[PDB]
């Protein structure tokens, strides 16, 4: 249960199921209808974002390490600076997110704790 919970990915409603049996762990949002799924590497996840407790809003997200270290042009003085990739998931229950947001973090802390 703790390693699973449904969420919204890109306006679609699917299921977010965490895999703590890996290393680094992994998140997997699969559509409810089975149209598509998004996998997440809690390790690659630059950080974990989730709606605050004071906010009835039930949503969890995982940021991704970006390559902003470059931040340069192409030739016409333009601007590239690769944008960051974060996985946003909207939960329809603070209980799911509460059970999920804890899971991810429960593992994450192990990456630093193990760092």
């Amino acid at each position: 249960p703790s390693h699973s919970g449904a969420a919204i990915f890109e306006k679609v409603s699917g299921i977010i199921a965490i895999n703590e049996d890996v290393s680094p762990a992994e998140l997997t949002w699969r559509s409810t209808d089975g149209d598509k799924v998004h996998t997440v590497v809690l390790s690659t996840i630059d950080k974990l974002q989730a709606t605050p407790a004071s906010s009835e809003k039930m949503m969890l997200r995982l940021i991704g390490k970006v390559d902003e270290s470059k931040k340069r042009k192409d030739n016409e003085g333009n601007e590239v600076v690769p944008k960051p990739q974060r996985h946003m998931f909207s939960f329809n229950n603070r209980t799911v997110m509460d059970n999920i947001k804890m899971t991810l973090q429960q593992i994450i802390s192990r990456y630093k704790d193990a760092d």
């Binding site: 950080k47 974990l48 974002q49 989730a50 709606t51 605050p52 809003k57 949503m59 994450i108």
Partner: peptide, 20 residues
Amino acid sequence: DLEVLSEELFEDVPTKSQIS
């Protein structure tokens, strides 16, 4: 279901270590 969310009140959860 046209628009009833809020991506402005989002916060970051506590995570050990800070390599920001």
